[PDB]
Design a protein around this ligand. Structure first.
Ligand SMILES: NC(=O)c1ccc[n+]([C@@H]2O[C@H](COP(=O)([O-])OP(=O)(O)OC[C@H]3O[C@@H](n4cnc5c(N)ncnc54)[C@H](O)[C@@H]3O)[C@@H](O)[C@H]2O)c1
Ligand SMILES: Oc1cc(Cl)ccc1Oc1ccc(Cl)cc1Cl
Length: 260
């Protein structure tokens, strides 16, 4: 029971055992954390129930982040079980499919823009607000996930690149707001990983192949590697670290073009 013994974390974002949020769950659990989970809808409820049970948790709450009331209620229900929280992991993204398929200028309509930012960036700030009393109780941390398409153009990432740039600025604004309470706020910028959301971005196979060919370690990263980095940033070993975007991409972001 070894780095996170006695600590409690809420995990939002598990869709399958392939999910980044699932590899994060696995790493925190391996070092002693007790876990709670959210689900976005009725259909997902059944799967998240099973996954939680696998980590030895009966703490499973609805949280569609489009709805203020569900965010608020998720943390209200959580506080009936836990008197404080050591961490909240936000591993959630969405944009309507059409926004990610085609020319950016033509396909980025108002509502598609609205939804991508609302789900993928606003929701982190809303979760942080709702979590604040429970995080204050234990000087808990916040963690979210981002992608380098915020800083450089990636094919068909499109408005998700805007929303991720917004999320990363949020990580800094949150860190400054919550830091006085000892609440650290960080993000991992992961390399491409084959998840359910990944199927559904048409350029994903090309991104995954480019990352394998170009990254200094010449291979793709895993949810275990992302989970392990998440474990570090959620632990006391990262007590000097806040507002940080940690790249877990095998060094890809550092290369301008590989040797041919
Ligand atoms: N897989 C990758 O290559 C990759 C790389 C870098 C960053 N990311 C980011 O990692 C995070 C995790 O995604 P993933 O790749 O694990 O995909 P995933 O499909 O496993 O997870 C996406 C999750 O978002 C949740 N979600 C979507 N809309 C929601 C709503 N309204 N309310 C609550 N939850 C909602 C989904 O239910 C799902 O659980 C996302 O922010 C994604 O942008 C992914
Ligand atoms: O951000 C991501 C980056 C990569 Cl390379 C792969 C998957 C990603 O995650 C998503 C991409 C599109 C949608 Cl609609 C929702 C999510 Cl969660």
């Amino acid at each position: 029971q070894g780095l996170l013994a006695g600590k409690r974390f809420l995990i939002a974002g598990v869709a399958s055992k392939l999910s980044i949020a699932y590899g994060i769950a696995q790493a925190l659990h391996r070092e002693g954390a007790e876990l709670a989970f959210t689900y976005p809808n009725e259909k997902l409820k059944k799967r998240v129930d099973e996954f939680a049970e696998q980590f030895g948790s009966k703490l499973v709450f609805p949280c569609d982040v489009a709805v203020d009331a569900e965010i608020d209620n998720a943390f209200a229900e959580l506080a009936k079980h836990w008197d404080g929280v050591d961490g909240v992991v936000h591993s959630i993204g969405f944009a309507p499919a059409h926004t990610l398929d085609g020319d950016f200028t033509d396909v980025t309509d108002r509502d598609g823009f609205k939804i991508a930012h609302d789900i993928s960036a606003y929701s982190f700030v809303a979760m942080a607000r709702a979590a604040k009393p429970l995080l204050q109780a234990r000087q808990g941390c916040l963690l979210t996930l981002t992608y380098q398409g915020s800083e450089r153009v990636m094919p068909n990432y499109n408005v998700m690149g805007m929303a991720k740039a917004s999320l990363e600025a949020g990580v800094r604004y949150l860190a400054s707001s919550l830091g006085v309470d000892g609440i650290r706020v960080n993000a991992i910028s992961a390399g491409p990983i084959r998840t359910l959301a990944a199927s559904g971005i048409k350029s994903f196979r090309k991104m995954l192949d480019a990352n394998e060919k170009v990254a200094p370690l010449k291979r793709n990263v895993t949810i275990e590697e992302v989970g392990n980095a998440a474990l570090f940033l959620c632990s006391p070993w990262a007590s000097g670290i806040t507002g940080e975007i940690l790249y877990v991409d095998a060094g890809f972001n550092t290369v301008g073009m590989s040797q041919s």
